[PDB]
Amino acid sequence: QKVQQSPESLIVPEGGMASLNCTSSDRNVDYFWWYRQHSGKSPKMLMSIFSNGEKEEGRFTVHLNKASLHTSLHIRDSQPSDSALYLCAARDSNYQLIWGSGTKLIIKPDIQNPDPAVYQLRDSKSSDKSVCLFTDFDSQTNVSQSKDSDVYITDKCVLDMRSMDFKSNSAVAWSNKSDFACANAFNNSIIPEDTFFP
Amino acid sequence: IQRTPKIQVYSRHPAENGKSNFLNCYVSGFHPSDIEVDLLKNGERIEKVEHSDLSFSKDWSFYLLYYTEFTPTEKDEYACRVNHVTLSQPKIVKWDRDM
Amino acid sequence: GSHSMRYFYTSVSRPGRGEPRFIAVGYVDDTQFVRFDSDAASQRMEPRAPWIEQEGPEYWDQETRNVKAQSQTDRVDLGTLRGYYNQSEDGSHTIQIMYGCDVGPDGRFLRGYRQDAYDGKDYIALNEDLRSWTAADMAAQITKRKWEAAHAAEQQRAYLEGRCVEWLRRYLENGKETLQRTDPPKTHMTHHPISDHEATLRCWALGFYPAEITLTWQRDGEDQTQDTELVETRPAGDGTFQKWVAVVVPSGQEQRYTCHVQHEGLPKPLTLRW
Amino acid sequence: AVTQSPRNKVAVTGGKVTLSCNQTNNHNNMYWYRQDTGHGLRLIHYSYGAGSTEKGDIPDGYKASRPSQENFSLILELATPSQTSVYFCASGDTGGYEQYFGPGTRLTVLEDLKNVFPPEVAVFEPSEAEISHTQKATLVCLATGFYPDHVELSWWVNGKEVHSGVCTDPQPLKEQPALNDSRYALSSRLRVSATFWQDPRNHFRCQVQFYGLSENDEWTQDRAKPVTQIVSAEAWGRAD
Amino acid sequence: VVGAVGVGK
Secondary structure (H helix, E strand, O other): OOEEEEOOEEEEEOOOOEEEEEEEOOOOOOOEEEEEEOOOOOOEEEEEEOOOEEEEEOOEEEEEEOOOOEEEEEEOOOOHHHOOEEEEEEEOOOOOEEEOOOEEEEEEOOOOOOOOEEEEEEEOOOOOOEEEEEEOOOOOOOOOOOOOOOEEEOOOEEOOEOOOOEOOEEEEEEEOOOOOOOOOOOOOOOOOOOOEOO | OOEOOEEEEEEOOOOOOOOOEEEEEEEEEEEOOOEEEEEEEOOEEOOOOEEOOOEEOOOOOEEEEEEEEEOOOOOOOEEEEEEEOOOOOOEEEEOOOOO | OOEEEEEEEEEEOOOOOOOOEEEEEEEEOOEEEEEEEOOOOOOOOEEOOHHHOOOOHHHHHHHHHHHHHHHHHHHHHHHHHHHHHOOOOOOOOEEEEEEEEEEOOOOOEEEEEEEEEEOOEEEEEEOOOOOOEEEOOHHHHHHHHHHHOOOHHHHHHHHHHHHHHHHHHHHHHHOHHHHOOOEOOEEEEEEEEOOOOEEEEEEEEEEEEOOOOEEEEEEOOEEOHHHEEEOOOEEOOOOOEEEEEEEEEEOOOHHHEEEEEEOOOOOOOEEEEO | OEEEEOOEEEEEOOOOEEEEEEEOOOOOEEEEEEEEOOOEEEEEEEEEEOOEEEEOOOOOOOEEEOOOOOEEEEEEOOOOHHHOEEEEEEEEOOOOOOOEEOOOEEEEEEOOHHHOEOOEEEEEOOOHHHHHHHOEEEEEEEEEEEEOOOEEEEEEEOOEEOOOOEEEOOOOEEOOOOOOOOOEEEEEEEEEEHHHHHOOOOEEEEEEEEOOEOOOOOOOOOOOOOEOEEEEEEEEOOOO | OOOOOOOOO
8 A cells, every 4th residue: 555554453551652653655745644533433633743753742642754754653641542443644745645554452451350250141021031241350351252153252342330430341142042051151261260150 | 906007018139120039018017917918010909919827926916928929120110008907098008129 | 046936826706707717827936837727728737847848747637636726725715705805796806825935055945935915915924934824904814713723834834844845956956957057148238319418328138047137327436226217127038037227318428327237147247338 | 513424324236325425614625535444544536626526546436526615425326335335524625734524424235135134132131140249230232133234222221321331342243154144243231230220110221223225225025124223122120 | 836725714
């Protein structure tokens, strides 16, 4: 492509520094941009640069070296709100924007009090169907994809209870067959030994 | 602001009769851009007259140059007819050799 | 020596008679090199200098495309400015835009400028710091407010300090044969008796380049600026310029007056005596 | 700001699809991008002003029109599966500081509509073990067997949509990843205080907005026409 | 090269 962007993906803990890079293969470029795009939303600009040096606006620092046609975006004290696709834009000689592939920033939250457990949930209308819920586990526990073809395990999700200031991870598994128990579920992942079982 | 054009009529090279030269009518320091200028040979309009590209000075006043190829003679008289919104009647500037 | 690149824009509204007429010309010092007329048949950026011919078809496609966007941009600006001044919807009005950058003998950036006008009067001009705007009237505050909120000063600076000088240096190198040389004036003097009592003495400067030139009369060393007829420097049509200067003399005192020619193409100033 | 319409559309191969973009920022330039994984944003068409349009990097198969300074529409005369993407509209100026982006349009173009299925939604009541251990009640909502992917899941508590204590899976998961045109499933969570769940007066409802066939689309099969509709499942609080 | 920024008056 005309504009090369790296890294493709990045995983950084809370409070760590996230550093991105962008390079344009076109020599006739004078302006650079960084846009932030949260999943399923329109991309908004973070900041811009067209001269050599740094540019700090809050926690964000932007560098540009027009000699090497390189820009870097630096985030200090990473927040979970910063987990979004970051796009790099370069201005053409036609005053048009050239877009890079984009960089996926993933930030793992700090689970303060991990109390992992698995529970059974029944359907409200009738008890014919049931599910397994793996919740309150730390970010270190990585959820592996479901193996038994009759059961599907959802991907990890980060909850945010704003009223009580509580963040919890959660995963869901469901199967249509009756020979399904939460004790025999989630065996395909790395379950910590301190989980609870009813 | 509307500015009355300044008109100078001259030749690209010094006038020698029977030798090809260019007749120049230089209209400058005028505003707005709408202006009609014709080159007159013995009181009649010259058909094929080229003109420069519209430009303006530091004070935003325009300037143009209309020119055509011609062969000066002892008898023939040349002049430039300039009509502008700031002119009540069209202004004639006779071509004075050495001016 | 020093050098400059400038672009001149003229947008004149034609209410009812069609679409606003847009004219754009580009200069390197005193040499035109690009042209665009909205009423022209080609509807493309046309070359006007031999040394700009070598640019590829991508160059002429982009400059034609970009200059059209300026005419489109100016089109709404004619309507926007009419509302500011509460002007008649049938009246014809003009918007003039001048911008460019200057470089030194070393080729380093010296100064950039951006100025806008409406109906022959100053409207808004970018200051020499390239970071603030100068408004000429109350209607310009509206444009100044809208441009300050849009970071227009930074955007224009990115061109003047950036792509402007970069292409200015490229043009100078491509046109070394025509842009970086000087043509000294072809000076001569002529005599014209007004009557049998007085005479007119004219000093001539033919085929010189660039436009900057100084012509002064002296009576025994005393300048005669008050008794002198001076005409504006005028183009000969072949890229060179002309200028003549007159003074009224007594019948027998022609030798008392001398004309001085100052021009950067002359290693030493010339003195013309009859 | 900048608005787009329609936000979600399902199209048939060979059909006609038009996307309208409106901007009130009175900028001179309007753009149509498409976002695809691995390609970023690729310009399709742009307009320097009213009445004029210009081809972009990938104008093939696409048409544009600029009737006024505010509206700029993208016309798809013959929709193809290769045109299934997310389209964004931008407004800006020639040397502008910023490009202002619209909310985006999720367009799915299908060769045959016989694979389109509305979702089935069920709500699962919290476990007593979780309430006993953590004094918090978690509700799980499953929307299964829907195609195409784009559906919108919302939680409604006592008639009010709730935005706190709710997270939905970022990506739908394929029921059968082997098969092409696979039917998708999505899950969501809602955590509240244990005392809130024990009150029987609180009504909990999970709503899934499925975007599918419109009224003008043709249908001649026995099963229910998978039109753009709403499928909901509800659960009442219980002291137990 | 053309470089006039057309922000809009």
